């Protein structure tokens, strides 16, 4: 806070500026960043090792831009799916590519940021978005003829009861609370789950920064 | 053959190059932009590819197209520039470098999804050169390029090679062939398209049963779903309501399949003894794509053998469509359908040719407008100087 | 003290003396020390069974749901406590551990009649 | 659980698997 | 394995003397 003799620290500012600058200038190309040593299963850049459960899927499968580099327009309007989704969810889960912006420092051109519109468990989101976990090796491309076989969706309704009992004590508290104010109605108190809907963990999160309203 | 000659290719391409540029000036401007690490217009490249007089300058074209596809604008290559490069190769050798940039694919980033593939293929047919036309077929299939009936042109070719096949095919060869039968055959017009579909589904079925399902779809535009033989037998089920199958080679190949599936069962040491590579590494790294409930295809063999024996008894007795040769009959078919399809392509490809010129014109206009604005603001800042 | 991040939470502070534990149920910042500063005291839980064979838990229910209503987070053991009380459904892990316990009793029953033979 | 789901898990966690467990005993016996 | 094309010499000594 304010004490009348307080010294003017200059270098505090200098280091902020200089650090931000050396950050922007040395900001790593994601070509080298997610680069992976397949023998040791170790990132050169971060020195990080990959989790045991991801090993096989790393050896045997391909990252997104590995399947998008050999596409003619670099794969616009194409449908893409993820191995994990195919194993867990029997309903269709795909990404439709809106933009693709590869990273060219790469000799083999395997890396880059993507965008699109997502269908998960058959439900479709109405907006464009940046796709998440591109660098992963789970990615697969669906062929043109099979496109209309995957996009084929059998629409089924949801059977989970809209309401459930309150937990035993809480129910008692509510009962007694309404007896006290002279409400005689013995209609069971019910807990309404309409807004308690949550997406399974597989559902990809938006990388886009939030606009504050 | 009819396509190329009757299309008047050379006249249009000679008519196309309007630009009047220099190769050394473009090379220095480019090299400069890559030195300072900045982007490069697709215009400079289209120009540089238009102005090539020599094989050496085609080498230089290759180099600068590479070093362009490794630059920020690599998605901005248009069709007419790719076209220019193909036609320049047609001016010189056409049979080497175009095939090398197509097989390289990803590096050079030509990706001519177009009538251009048809063009290249015809320029192979005229001059013979089978094997290289085959590889180009494979790459047109890998890019899954058929909205055009290059398919027939390719189906034709593949079926030529289909007779040119007497050999013992390895894993990747069998795969390649299955894919070149399947993805090119879309044809509902004829029996031959359908029985080439049968051929493909059969070959890929062999690939599956012998090695693994993963071997099939790995890099190929195919589906990971295990049923394949079932898809073929479904196409043979379509014959109850439909006239035609071509159906000699369906017989022959599905006979070879049924014979290897049979022979593998009683003789374990004859059929399955061939993979010695690593037992401990393959047992430890063993992965299973298939579920426990999924009913592995190897357990369905008694049904398959029945269907192919039931269905082949029906088809020949009902459809009566047994072909005496697939090679020749297909050849006749696509040679018959060829001319009208040409006549339909000529109309479109022309409008594309004018469109591309409109685009180039607009873009040069933008170049000029920009440069003039930059010169006016430069004169305004140089004549009267105000800076902080 | 000023922190970078972290959320409001309902946890157990551990008071007590060696071998005789005691807990103060507490609403605290997440990043601050276990026994340290807190926002509000909520309840107490005494693990050791008393003269009457009871573990005493105290919950200020009104304030608890005031904070849950501000989006405070619960610790797994506080979850287990509320659930036990019946103010929350049973925590799945309570149920599961119960089942595991049952199967252990079963296998020790069989092992007992197998060793007796 | 449904058998399709059990097999699905089995595919996911393969080799890292453990012995499948059945229904819990209803009441718990003593020593 | 792919080997990139060697650096071009694009000089025409007739245009610039
Ligand atoms: Mg880490
Ligand atoms: Mg102490």
UniProtKB/TrEMBL annotation, chain B:
Signal peptide annotation: none
Keyword list, A-Z: Coiled coil, Cytoplasm, Mitochondrion, Repeat, Ribonucleoprotein, Ribosomal protein, RNA-binding, rRNA-binding, Transit peptide, Translation regulation, tRNA-binding
GO CC, one annotated term: mitochondrial inner membrane
Compartments where found: Cytoplasm; Mitochondrion
Gene Ontology MF term list: rRNA binding; tRNA binding
Family: Belongs to the mitochondrion-specific ribosomal protein mS27 family.
PANTHER family with a match to the protein in the record: MITOCHONDRIAL 28S RIBOSOMAL PROTEIN S27 (PTHR21393), SMALL RIBOSOMAL SUBUNIT PROTEIN MS27 (PTHR21393:SF0)
Name this protein carries in UniProt: Small ribosomal subunit protein mS27
Species of the source: Sus scrofa
Phylogenetic lineage: Eukaryota, Metazoa, Chordata, Craniata, Vertebrata
Gene, per the UniProt record: MRPS27
TrEMBL record, chain E:
Subcellular location per the Swiss-Prot or TrEMBL entry: Mitochondrion
Top-level taxon in the UniProt lineage: Eukaryota
Family: Belongs to the bacterial ribosomal protein bL19 family.
Protein's name in the database: Large ribosomal subunit protein bL19m
Source organism (scientific name): Sus scrofa (Pig)
Lineage of origin: Eukaryota, Metazoa, Chordata, Craniata, Vertebrata
Section covered of the full-length record: 64 to 80 of 303
């Amino acid at each position: 806070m304010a004490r009348k003799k307080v010294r003017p620290r200059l270098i505090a500012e200098l280091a902020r500026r200089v650090r931000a600058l050396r950050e922007q200038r040395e900001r790593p190309r994601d070509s080298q960043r997610y680069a992976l040593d397949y023998e040791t299963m170790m990132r050169p850049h971060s020195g990080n090792r990959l989790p045991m459960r991801a090993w096989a899927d790393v050896r045997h499968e391909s990252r997104l831009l590995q399947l998008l580099n050999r596409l003619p327009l670099f794969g616009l309007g194409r449908l893409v799916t993820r191995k994990s989704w195919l194993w867990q969810h029997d309903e269709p889960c795909y990404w439709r590519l809106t933009r693709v912006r590869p990273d060219y420092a790469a000799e083999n051109l395997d890396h880059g940021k993507a965008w699109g519109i997502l269908t998960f468990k058959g439900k479709t989101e109405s907006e464009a978005r940046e796709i998440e976990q591109v660098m992963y090796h789970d990615w697969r491309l669906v062929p043109k003829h099979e496109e209309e076989a995957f996009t084929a969706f059998t629409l089924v309704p949801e059977d989970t009861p809209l309401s459930v009992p309150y937990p035993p004590l809480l129910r008692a508290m509510i009962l007694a609370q309404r007896q006290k104010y002279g409400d005689t109605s013995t209609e069971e108190p019910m807990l309404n789950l309409e807004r308690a809907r949550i997406d399974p963990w597989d559902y990809p999160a938006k990388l886009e920064a939030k606009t504050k309203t | 053959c009819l396509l190329s000659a009757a299309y008047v290719d050379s006249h249009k391409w000679e008519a196309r190059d309007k630009e009047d540029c220099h190769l050394a000036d473009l090379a220095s401007l480019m090299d400069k932009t890559y030195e300072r690490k900045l982007p490069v217009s697709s215009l400079t490249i289209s120009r540089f590819v238009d102005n090539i007089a020599s094989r050496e300058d085609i080498d230089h074209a290759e180099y600068y197209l590479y070093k362009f596809r490794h630059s920020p604008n690599c998605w901005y290559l248009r069709d007419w520039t790719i076209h220019t490069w193909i036609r320049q190769c047609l001016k010189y050798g056409a049979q080497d470098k175009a095939l090398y940039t197509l097989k390289n694919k990803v590096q050079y980033g030509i990706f001519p999804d177009n009538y251009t593939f048809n063009l290249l293929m015809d320029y192979f047919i005229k001059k013979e050169n089978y094997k290289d036309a085959l590889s180009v077929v494979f790459e047109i299939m890998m890019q899954e390029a058929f909205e055009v009936p290059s398919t027939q042109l390719l189906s034709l070719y593949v079926l030529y090679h289909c007779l040119a096949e007497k050999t013992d095919l390895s894993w990747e060869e069998e795969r390649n062939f299955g894919a070149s039968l399947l993805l090119p055959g879309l044809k509902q017009k004829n029996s031959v398209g359908l029985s080439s579909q049968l051929y493909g589904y059969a070959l890929l079925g062999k690939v599956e049963l012998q090695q693994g399902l993963r071997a099939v779809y790995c890099n190929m535009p195919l589906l990971w779903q295990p049923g394949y033989l079932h898809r073929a037998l479904q196409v043979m089920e379509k014959v109850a309501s439909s006239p035609e199958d071509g159906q000699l080679c369906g017989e022959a190949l599905d006979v070879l399949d049924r014979v290897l599936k049979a022979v593998t069962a009683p003789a374990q040491g004859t059929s399955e003894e061939q993979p010695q590579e690593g037992e401990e590494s393959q047992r430890s790294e063993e992965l299973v794509e298939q579920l426990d409930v999924e009913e592995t295809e190897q357990s369905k063999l008694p049904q398959y053998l029945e269907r192919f024996e039931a269905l082949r008894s029906k088809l020949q007795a009902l459809g009566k469509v047994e072909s005496e040769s697939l090679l020749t009959l297909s050849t006749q078919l696509a040679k018959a359908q060829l001319p009208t399809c040409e006549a339909e392509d000529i109309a479109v490809y022309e409008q594309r040719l004018q469109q591309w010129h409109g685009e180039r014109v607009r873009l040069i206009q933008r170049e000029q407008e920009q440069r003039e604005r930059a010169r006016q603001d430069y004169e305004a800042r140089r004549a009267a100087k105000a800076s902080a | 003290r000023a922190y970078r991040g972290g959320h409001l939470t309902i946890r157990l502070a551990l008071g007590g003396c060696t071998n005789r534990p005691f807990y103060r149920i507490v609403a605290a910042h997440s990043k601050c020390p276990r026994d340290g500063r807190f926002v509000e005291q909520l309840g107490s839980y005494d693990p050791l069974p008393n003269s009457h064979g009871e573990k005493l838990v105290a919950l200020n229910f009104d304030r608890i749901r005031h904070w849950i209503g501000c989006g405070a987070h619960l610790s797994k053991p506080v979850e287990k406590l509320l659930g036990l009380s019946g103010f929350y459904p049973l925590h799945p892990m309570m149920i599961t551990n119960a089942e595991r316990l049952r199967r252990k009793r079963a296998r020790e029953v069989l092992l007992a009649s197998q060793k007796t033979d | 659980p449904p058998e399709r789901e059990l097999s699905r898990l089995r595919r996911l966690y393969q080799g890292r698997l453990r012995e499948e467990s059945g229904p819990p005993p209803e009441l718990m016996p003593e020593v | 394995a792919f080997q990139p094309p060697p650096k071009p010499v694009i000089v025409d000594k007739r245009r610039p003397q």
